[PDB]
Amino acid sequence: TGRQAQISNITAAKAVADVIRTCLGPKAMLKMLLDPMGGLVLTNDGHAILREIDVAHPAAKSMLELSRTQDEEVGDGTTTVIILAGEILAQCAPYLIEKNIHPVIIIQALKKALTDALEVIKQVSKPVDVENDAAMKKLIQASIGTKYVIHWSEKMCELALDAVKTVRKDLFEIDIKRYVRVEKIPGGDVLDSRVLKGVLLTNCGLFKVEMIGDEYFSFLDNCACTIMLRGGSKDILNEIDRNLQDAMAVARNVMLSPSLSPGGGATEMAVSVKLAEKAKQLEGIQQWPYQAVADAMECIPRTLIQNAGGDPIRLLSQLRAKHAQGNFTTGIDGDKGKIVDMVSYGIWEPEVIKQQSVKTAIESACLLLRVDDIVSGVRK
Template structure:
């Protein structure tokens, strides 16, 4: 038979297809969701993870937990990827997206058992997702005034309230809002808030968490290069460089032949003159402080001390860019191209302080810093790492609200309102599509249900009461108090979430469930080397490995 493709599978190739794969994928998604389930809400539990190197991580951040987990199942791997996507896109809602994704897969299972085709289920899910996002924007979300400090504090507090830092939530919210507002930059009517690059978190063990603060400038873990240099300068003129203040070494192929003794001293003199020229170029601009990404030789230090200039060397490129943005300077590549406008003059105070055993350089009191450092203090490295993760989430929330100023009620209220709306809409849908459509509404209830479970309240009774509440008019903002499990109005309770986070959670969770439902075949081919003992040794030729379909079945 010509023209027909023949799939030849050898006996090492595993192939699963049809219903078995679909149920396997659903179970893998549910298993990942079960790991994360207890990490939702203010009564969430921490997970202790041990990495192969023997280090430990204690966290309730969904993304951090899933990053450390090793899984073999391909569907479980794609669920873990979902948390990463959510984290990169909006920086919050990683736990919710996994729980919701697992639940959407779970509600699809009965339809597959009833022989409903996955394509029918998928088209109903897509329809539900479109209606859901439309309802979220038009009916559930409310615009917010981002200039109102108290409102912004409430929003960030609802994010920090579920984390380890909830005890210091006022401090955390203040730090997150200050840092985000500092790095916000408006260019051509577009807001750019790059907290990853310009709001650096520096963790110093020791002290208490209350000592943490946002610096109006930059802090780096460096000391001056020479003990005689000044360690405190007010209103310094700062010069930022990424070139060496030392003699350029020849490349590997450079050869110098010296025949006379005077030649050696001549070469040394040339080196010294080169360094002197570079230092004179720098000194001519009269800076008070030089920060370079490369080295500063002993001779250069000597010239700089004579001119009363302080130098700091081998600063990271990312730190140098932050300093440039905070004090208004330009990073220069060559000393002979220095100009007055390259000088950074926006810094109020340069100071080297000793904290614990190490020296730290502070460049603070900047006029208009568009970059900042968040200084975290705490009892141990583990606590500081967790506090940093919580702060990153809080800053992401502040950034999202500043970029898209809409809010939705938290505590499962938005999910219940959407479930109610979808149930109403399902009545107008005819045909077999309405059942998977209703199932999405049921899946949304997993968020309030998990919140109730995590604080130990009666799940069925509370959820039924919440459903009844949402059936009434104008009760869209009623949700679950994550501390006690009671039903409260989120408007009065003050728990809000950014619209962009919620929309991203629904999009990512339902899209992933759709993707996994479309898979009906998993083929994994692992070639094993034929064992040398099994290979027949006759006439010097080894027989080819048997192929499936050619008499090679075991």
């Protein structure tokens, strides 16, 4: 009731965020679930975790719809963004339930925080040309490092980058890439693919019909592109779409935001050290809840340290000093927990990855603060 009802809502998102802390990165851990029916689900993806679990906390139910929005854009690595919404709720404990800070005052501070965050996003902006196929090849392979299809992606990711550019082009560049039709053929080898430019069913070169147990082959000459995938196993087709069909978000994000940000949770390192410097120039009542947001920003990279088995207190001492002094291009190695910068790490992510992450986090955090209490038993 009142402030006591908001405490249960903070711990509701805190308990869920603590489970997905280990779900980020190539070192991401797994979680096992036990339902009252006796079924067990063991996976490292937080998407199916929030869908199968029915939570008794009404505040945690709002995070289920937020995960559907984050998964609609990318879906890989964006599940852990909910932690940022949970760290802000825990950050208000010295303020909301102690200093009696009004929620709108915190929301107004988040409005200035979201505005200043986009300025920091434009500071780490690193544009790159999309005409180079080799530059775009290593870009889509970023999310592949979490799977064993890495060495298989040589004949896989090349088909996705060529099909999107046909249905993208320009107009701005806004277009519809959903006209592509991907066909999956079970059995065979993953190395076997089909290169087809046209519509699958003037001066046509040739017409032929192959032999396939599923259906036949038909070519339609236009004045649109299709993909025929041959999987290396029976049920592997589910993971193939995650590394190709779901990987189309990388090709969509590079067209909307050609700029590149540090990948593997290395972006918010330069954001947290910069947000603390922008707070000293505010000099107001809202400075304390505004500066405390940087304390919630440094909790996200600690997930890598928890995955790398390091000490987040001692390691971030030198790590935060590199982003606030040397340069903002430095980063954190997630594998071994090392200071190796993102320059030689070879992975960069678009700016929109963190843009949609912070935008949906602030919008979801303020709505949870606007709720005074929760009542039950209405019998609708």
